Amino acid sequence: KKKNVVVFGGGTGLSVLLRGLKTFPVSITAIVTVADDGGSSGRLRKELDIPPPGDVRNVLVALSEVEPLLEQLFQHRFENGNGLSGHSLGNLLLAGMTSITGDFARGISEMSKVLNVRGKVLPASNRSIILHGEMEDGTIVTGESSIPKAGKKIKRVFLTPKDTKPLREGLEAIRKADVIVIGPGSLYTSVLPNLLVPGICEAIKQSTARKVYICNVMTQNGETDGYTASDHLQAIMDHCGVGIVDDILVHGEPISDTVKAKYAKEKAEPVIVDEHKLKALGVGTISDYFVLEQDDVLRHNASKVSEAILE
Amino acid sequence: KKKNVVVFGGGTGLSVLLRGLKTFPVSITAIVTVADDGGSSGRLRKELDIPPPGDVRNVLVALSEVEPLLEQLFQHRFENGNGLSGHSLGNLLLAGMTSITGDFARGISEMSKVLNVRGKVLPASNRSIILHGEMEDGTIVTGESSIPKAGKKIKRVFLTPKDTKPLREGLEAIRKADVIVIGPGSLYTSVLPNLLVPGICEAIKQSTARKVYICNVMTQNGETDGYTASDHLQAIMDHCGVGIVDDILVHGEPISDTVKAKYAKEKAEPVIVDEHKLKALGVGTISDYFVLEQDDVLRHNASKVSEAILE
């Protein structure tokens, strides 16, 4: 009752949860990855020299409290203009804000006020980060969006520049935290590039807060093929060490044959839950029906999940 | 008792005046031109198929009431992107809004609320307009921005499509107006293409309101070379007819040799005030010191001007 929550995640999965988690009596601090280099965000960091804003844009909208009209405007994506075509008005909005203030965090902060955000959203770092991936067979793929495309098995990921630093408010928030949520989002392309910022795993270990890891429901082609729940947990323990996760929240129910097939048409399978290996890794298991279909697509159901992670 | 004022102007001059006029005890309605095809606006109307927002953006920011920080964001102009470079964030914001509403006017309406606009801003038309100039040598030059670039003399400008229509709010505001203001803005590329919208000139003649025409201080290369004050008035009557202007407002003091010189390097000379030709045309003349040097460039000083047009 009146808990401080920090969420390390990325992608659509994180916005879904955030749109729900905010109606609970919890103070949210969402630290967003700044390593993506795909799509609009990718072009923007290259031609504008700023951190990719895409993920922050979506976290921002999810926690926003404004008219639908304005929310659509912020989410507007241009269809034509070739050079403008593909960009998200919210991305360009954020890009312009960080130019003026010359500080990405500060820009995100100013946008929060505009969007009337309940809480705080911080970038994992105030400068661009590059995601690199070492494959099972030693091959190195550089670039967040290129890793999955390599079609190989990921062995380990790492950030660059090595001297990358998190925001003070970041470490600060992890301290005051009552609960730390690892995820939801891609294991290697969103959750780890967040956690891997220098000082974060460490800061999290020291925190006395309860750490809940929202494990993926589906696998991802070229990233987590064949992974079970423990395979995910393992990868995190390997990159961050023990005491980074206390309980792992999983979807322990079946997935419809229909949804299962739509994903299958994408080399994505349900993430099997090995209750035993999980208990072996020393973490508790929060298992329940934690998802819901949305036109043959699975989303987390923020209400249920938020309730769970809040004990 | 708020006095209702309607303003037909364009460009920087319109923004400058508005910024000051809004502080007086009046209710403003600014009908903005949508015939411009140059720069960022030209690019947008071409690839996004919407009316040019630039001129509207400057009126929106001018009558707005937000924090300086937001006001800059709106006025932010991207420097790189080579497909994004040149574009104004405020133009794109307006473009995005109009895409969502499918209505330029409505889009503008929504942005007013966002920007807390003190008054009503309306586009001359809800669809794009093309400006054409009939030169002295019978030739025709199409496109607002190619006209001055022709290096010839303008005999007359006209609009396309012929079936272009104003907004009902426009005819309405003119009816209810206590004062109608023609200008400031370029005679042939800002004011006339605005007035020339079907129904506008007529609606004005029928209006029993006071009609003040703010004449240009400087001439413009390729548009009004060598034009005197009366040459300007003449063009307006020759296009809209009599009963369109009651009094002409002109800067009757000298301009500094310093300003004069800078403008000279642009083929821009001061507009000589022919007291007699102005009288022969049957309009009163308000002559005072209505300008001020702003970094050697000439602006208007809305206070002094607003005070005059309000009698």
Curated annotation (Swiss-Prot), chains A, B:
Chain segments annotated as transmembrane: none
| Entry GO terms, CC | cytoplasm
Against Gene3D superfamilies, the record matches this protein to: CofD-like domains
Can the keyword Membrane be found in this entry's annotation? no
Q: One MF term in GO for this entry?
A: LPPG:FO 2-phospho-L-lactate transferase activity
Q: What does this protein do?
A: Required for morphogenesis under gluconeogenic growth conditions.
- Protein name per the record: Gluconeogenesis factor
Source organism of the structure: Halalkalibacterium halodurans (strain ATCC BAA-125 / DSM 18197 / FERM 7344 / JCM 9153 / C-125)
